[PDB]
C-alpha cells in the first residue's frame, strides 16, 4: 500500500498549480481520497475531499480553498488530484494525500507561493581535522549558504551514509537568504580511503551539487 | 466549523513516564477522534481511531478514551522511539479539522557536548565573506551556551544558532553556531574561539584554530 505526491513547487501568488497523487496496492475506486497540507504556523489542515461513483463524486472543500480548488480523480489510473489557482502565500505548506480513515499517508509535496525571486545556494566543505577530532571520531560536514526559498535537502554518499548525520533546521540570515549546515562523525581512520560526498538539491533553483569533502592536516604531523 | 483544542502544547517526559494528551470539541463529534504520531522529517502515522481503538501494528503502550467532547490519548510508558509531535482529528463532520499538536521532549540524564570547530573553506574566501562554524554534537539538556571569541574579544550581534530535533535513540541534540564576517574582518585577527558553556561540562569548553593554520 503506497501514495505517492508530485506537483509542487515554488509559484507567484495569483498563480496556479496542479498536485498529483498515484496509489498502488489497495482498490482505489473503493476509497474516499482527502489532501490534508501542513505549514509550521497553521499546523494541519484538511483541505478536499473526494467520494466515491456512487456519489457521483461528491466532493467537499475547507472554506478557505472555496471556488479556488478543485478535487478530481482518475480510478481507472488510481490517481487523484488537486487544481489549485489563485494562490495565496497562506496556501504555503507541504500537502499530503490521504484516503478515507486516513490509514495511510504520502511523503508530500512542497507548494511554496512567493512572489520573490528564486536563488541557489553554495556548497561550502566543512573539512574534517584534528580541530573537529575526538577520541578516534572525526566530524565533516557542508555549508549551504544563501539560498531562497526553502527547502534544501542534503544526503551523504547518495544515501549510503545516514549513521550520525545530523542537517541543522535552515536559519534566515539577516539578508534575507537561507543557511544551513549538515554535519556527520566519522572513524578518523575512515578519512584515508572514503570518499566523502554531500549531495545537495534545492529544486526551486535547480540545483543539484555534489560536494566532495576533502580532510585538512593543519599541524597534526608535527 | 468545529475546533478542536488540545493540551499540552508541549510535555517533558522520562522515558518509562506516562504521557497524557487531551482535546476538547467545540461541539460533540461522537466518537469520530483520531491521534496521529508525526516523527521529525516524516509524515503523520495513524495511532488510535473511534477515539479508542488502536490501529494495525501499533504497540499496547498507546491507548485513547473518550466521547462527545473530552479526548484523551495516552502513553503508557514513553520510549525514545515515541519522540514526535502528536496531534488529534476530529472525522465527524466537514471541515474536519486538527488539534494545534503537542510537542514531547524526552528527559534524560545529562550529556555534556563534543565540541567541533571548522574554519572557513578556502573557496568561501576568494568570494570575500568567512563563514565559522562550532559543532555541539550529542547533548543533553538543549540549554547550552556558546560564546564566540575573536583574540580574546567576546563577539555580539554576528553569529546564529540551529538546533536539531531530538534523537530518536539516544534522545541527545546536536546544536550549530556560525559565525559570520567580511573576509576583510576575518583576515584582521588570529585566533577564533568557540566557548560552550553546559551542565555537563564541569567547566566551559573551548575549540580553537588560527586564521592559516589549517
Ligand atoms: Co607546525
Known sequence: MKLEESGGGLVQPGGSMKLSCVASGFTFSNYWMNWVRQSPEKGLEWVAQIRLKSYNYATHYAESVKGRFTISRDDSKSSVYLQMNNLRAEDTGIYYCTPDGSDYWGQGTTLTVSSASTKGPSVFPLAPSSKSTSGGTAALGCLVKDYFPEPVTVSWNSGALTSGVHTFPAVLQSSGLYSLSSVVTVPSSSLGTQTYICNVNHKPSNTKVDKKVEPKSCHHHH | ?214
Open chain 2, 1 to 214: 466549523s468545529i475546533v478542536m483544542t488540545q493540551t499540552p502544547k508541549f510535555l517533558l517526559v522520562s522515558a518509562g513516564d506516562r504521557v497524557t494528551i487531551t482535546c476538547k470539541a467545540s461541539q460533540s463529534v461522537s466518537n469520530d477522534v483520531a491521534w496521529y504520531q508525526q516523527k521529525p522529517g516524516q509524515s503523520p502515522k495513524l495511532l488510535i481511531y473511534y477515539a479508542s481503538n488502536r490501529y494495525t501494528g501499533v504497540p499496547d503502550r498507546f491507548t485513547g478514551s473518550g466521547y462527545g467532547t473530552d479526548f484523551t490519548f495516552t502513553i503508557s510508558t514513553v520510549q525514545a522511539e515515541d519522540l514526535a509531535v502528536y496531534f488529534c482529528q476530529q472525522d465527524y463532520s466537514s471541515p474536519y479539522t486538527f488539534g494545534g499538536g503537542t510537542k514531547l521532549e524526552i528527559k534524560r540524564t545529562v550529556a555534556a557536548p563534543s565540541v567541533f570547530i571548522f574554519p572557513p573553506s578556502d573557496e568561501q574566501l576568494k568570494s570575500g565573506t568567512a563563514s565559522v562554524v562550532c559543532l555541539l554534537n550529542n547533548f543533553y539538556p538543549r540549554e547550552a551556551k556558546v560564546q564566540w571569541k575573536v583574540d580574546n574579544a567576546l563577539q555580539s550581534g554576528n553569529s546564529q544558532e540551529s538546533v536539531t530535533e531530538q534523537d530518536s535513540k539516544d534522545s541527545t541534540y546536536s546544536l550549530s553556531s556560525t559565525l559570520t564576517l567580511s573576509k576583510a574582518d576575518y583576515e584582521k585577527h588570529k585566533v577564533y574561539a568557540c566557548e560552550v558553556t553546559h551542565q555537563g561540562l564541569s567547566s566551559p569548553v573551548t575549540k580553537s584554530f588560527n586564521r592559516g593554520e589549517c
